Amino acid sequence: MENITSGFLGPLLVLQAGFFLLTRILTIPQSLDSWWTSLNFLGGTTVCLGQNSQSPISNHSPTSCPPTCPGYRWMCLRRFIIFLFILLLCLIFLLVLLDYQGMLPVCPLIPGSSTTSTGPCRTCTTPAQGTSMYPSCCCTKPSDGNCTCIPIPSSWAFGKFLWEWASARFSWLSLLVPFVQWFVGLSPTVWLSVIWMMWYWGPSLYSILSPFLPLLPIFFCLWVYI
Amino acid sequence: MENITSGFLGPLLVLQAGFFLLTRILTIPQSLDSWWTSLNFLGGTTVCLGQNSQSPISNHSPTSCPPTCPGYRWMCLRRFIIFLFILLLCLIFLLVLLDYQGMLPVCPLIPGSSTTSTGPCRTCTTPAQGTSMYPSCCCTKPSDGNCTCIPIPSSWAFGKFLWEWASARFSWLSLLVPFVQWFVGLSPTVWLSVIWMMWYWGPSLYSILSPFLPLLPIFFCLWVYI
Amino acid sequence: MENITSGFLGPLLVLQAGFFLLTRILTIPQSLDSWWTSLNFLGGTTVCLGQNSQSPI
Amino acid sequence: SWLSLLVPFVQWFVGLSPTVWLSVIWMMWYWGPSLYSILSPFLPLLPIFFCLWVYI
Numbered sequence: 331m332e333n334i335t336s337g338f339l340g341p342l343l344v345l346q347a348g349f350f351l352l353t354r355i356l357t358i359p360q361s362l363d364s365w366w367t368s369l370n371f372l373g374g375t376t377v378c379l380g381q382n383s384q385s386p387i388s389n390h391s392p393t394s395c396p397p398t399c400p401g402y403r404w405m406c407l408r409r410f411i412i413f414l415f416i417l418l419l420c421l422i423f424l425l426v427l428l429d430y431q432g433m434l435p436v437c438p439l440i441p442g443s444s445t446t447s448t449g450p451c452r453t454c455t456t457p458a459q460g461t462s463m464y465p466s467c468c469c470t471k472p473s474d475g476n477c478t479c480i481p482i483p484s485s486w487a488f489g490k491f492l493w494e495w496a497s498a499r500f501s502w503l504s505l506l507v508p509f510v511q512w513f514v515g516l517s518p519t520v521w522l523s524v525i526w527m528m529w530y531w532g533p534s535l536y537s538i539l540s541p542f543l544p545l546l547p548i549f550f551c552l553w554v555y556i
Numbered sequence: 557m558e559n560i561t562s563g564f565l566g567p568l569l570v571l572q573a574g575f576f577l578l579t580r581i582l583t584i585p586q587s588l589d590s591w592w593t594s595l596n597f598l599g600g601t602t603v604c605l606g607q608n609s610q611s612p613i614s615n616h617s618p619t620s621c622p623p624t625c626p627g628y629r630w631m632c633l634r635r636f637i638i639f640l641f642i643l644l645l646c647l648i649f650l651l652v653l654l655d656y657q658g659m660l661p662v663c664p665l666i667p668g669s670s671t672t673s674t675g676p677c678r679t680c681t682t683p684a685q686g687t688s689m690y691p692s693c694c695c696t697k698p699s700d701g702n703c704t705c706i707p708i709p710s711s712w713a714f715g716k717f718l719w720e721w722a723s724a725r726f727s728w729l730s731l732l733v734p735f736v737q738w739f740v741g742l743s744p745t746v747w748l749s750v751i752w753m754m755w756y757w758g759p760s761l762y763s764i765l766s767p768f769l770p771l772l773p774i775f776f777c778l779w780v781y782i
Numbered sequence: 783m784e785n786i787t788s789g790f791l792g793p794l795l796v797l798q799a800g801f802f803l804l805t806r807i808l809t810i811p812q813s814l815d816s817w818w819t820s821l822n823f824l825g826g827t828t829v830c831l832g833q834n835s836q837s838p839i
Numbered sequence: 840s841w842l843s844l845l846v847p848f849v850q851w852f853v854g855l856s857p858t859v860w861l862s863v864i865w866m867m868w869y870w871g872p873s874l875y876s877i878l879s880p881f882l883p884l885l886p887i888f889f890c891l892w893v894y895i
Contacts, residue, residue: 379599401598491659
């Protein structure tokens with residue numbers, strides 16, 4: 331062992347990493363076939379309908395399958411679609427993971443008057459054009475020379491800037507933001523109960539909603555006059 | 557009150573309009589369901605799995621037994637999952653669309669002596685470990701230092717902080733990018749020829765590589781360990 | 783401009799809304815119809831038991 | 840003389856890379872009879888084009 335073990339392990343580590351990557355790639359097609367098929371197979375079988383008569387097999391070609399049996403090009407197409415979906419999903423997941431980051435940039439520029447500096451202002455900003463919006467802070471104002479704006483927050487990511495834009499878009503949603511805020515403020519043993527209630531009883535809830543779904547315009551007519 | 561008639565008119569108009577939109581939104585889940593169904597119905601034609609044999613639908617099988625009949629919880633759950641996936645895709649699309657917009661900043665950092673305009677360095681000297689993504693540069697240093705730093709420059713790929721600034725996390729990836737460009741840029745009748753050949757014998761070749769690909773893990777570790 | 787717009791469009795929108803309201807009112811009926819259809823379903827059919835023999839349909 | 844003018848055309852067409860003739864042949868396999876069937880109506884169109892260029 332000793333150094334020879336380490337030298338082999340380095341190559342062994344590379345081989346294991348590559349094999350794991352290839353297995354993950356293959357499984358993503360297999361696993362996606364699994365999920366969606368069970369979606370079709372929730373009360374259903376897995377018999378590949380692409381197994382045509384000119385492909386002699388009783389049922390050997392009948393599970394999210396084709397290899398080369400009869401219809402196989404469309405199975406490859408399904409595999410490619412699954413690969414694209416998996417690529418998109420993993421890209422999104424990595425994007426979120428690097429999005430929190432603690433340190434991702436989120437340099438914001440919105441109208442405000444919050445002050446935290448050393449001996450600041452007494453010249454400040456006097457821009458009477460372009461409304462209250464602020465541009466890149468090299469020196470935002472048309473005539474600003476000693477300008478200094480606001481540094482990125484140790485919270486989240488550009489979601490702050492979007493929320494600033496989003497709050498402009500919607501104000502009723504801003505009011506409901508406290509509602510979801512206190513909803514998430516509930517303890518961890520809240521989401522599980524919510525899921526359990528939504529479990530089973532949720533289809534009945536959608537059923538019951540279907541009645542009021544026709545009645546929804548009538549209900550809106552009240553607030554419409556309001 | 558002829559004008560007031562007009563008001564109630566516009567109100568009920570908005571009413572029916574939102575009604576339809578909903579209908580369109582609900583169909584969008586059903587539309588995606590049909591789309592993926594055809595994806596599965598590449599081989600298949602039409603079926604709803606839950607439909608029991610002892611059922612008036614029987615020959616009526618698609619979404620006919622997704623909730624009103626037979627398999628309700630799982631089929632409706634699949635519909636809800638598809639709707640959630642569609643909503644997530646829509647959110648991603650909106651985020652991608654808002655990319656090239658206004659108030660779009662990357663707020664990046666890189667070491668250089670360039671300046672957008674007349675910038676006096678005044679012996680700008682204060683360095684630190686990890687020059688990229690240094691302190692806020694609000695003249696946050698042992699002294700002020702007469703600092704001028706980067707605004708949010710007007711260019712595409714605002715998230716270049718990862719594309720190039722964090723590209724140092726994998727230098728070989730940058731090296732492979734030159735190799736990617738080397739592979740690219742051939743004659744116009746090169747990508748088309750590759751596509752035609754791949755469509756011609758892609759299945760046979762992929763089968764040909766099957767165990768060779770499994771056998772590939774053996775090699776290129778020993779070569780390094782040599 | 784010769785664009786009448788105004789009342790001519792207003793009457794047309796009124797007719798469309800009235801048709802929609804009539805459809806909704808009738809649905810309310812068939813809406814309760816199918817909610818009581820839900821009442822009898824979970825394994826229940828809906829055929830006309832009365833309209834079985836004494837009808838040429 | 841006009842043959843020489845078209846000679847450079849064929850010279851550069853066949854002057855393409857080796858992976859051009861195979862694609863052309865494969866197209867000929869798939870299209871030849873189908874192309875003949877499609878262009879059969881064009882024969883009546885061909886007299887119309889000849890008449891058009893006749894005045895030109």
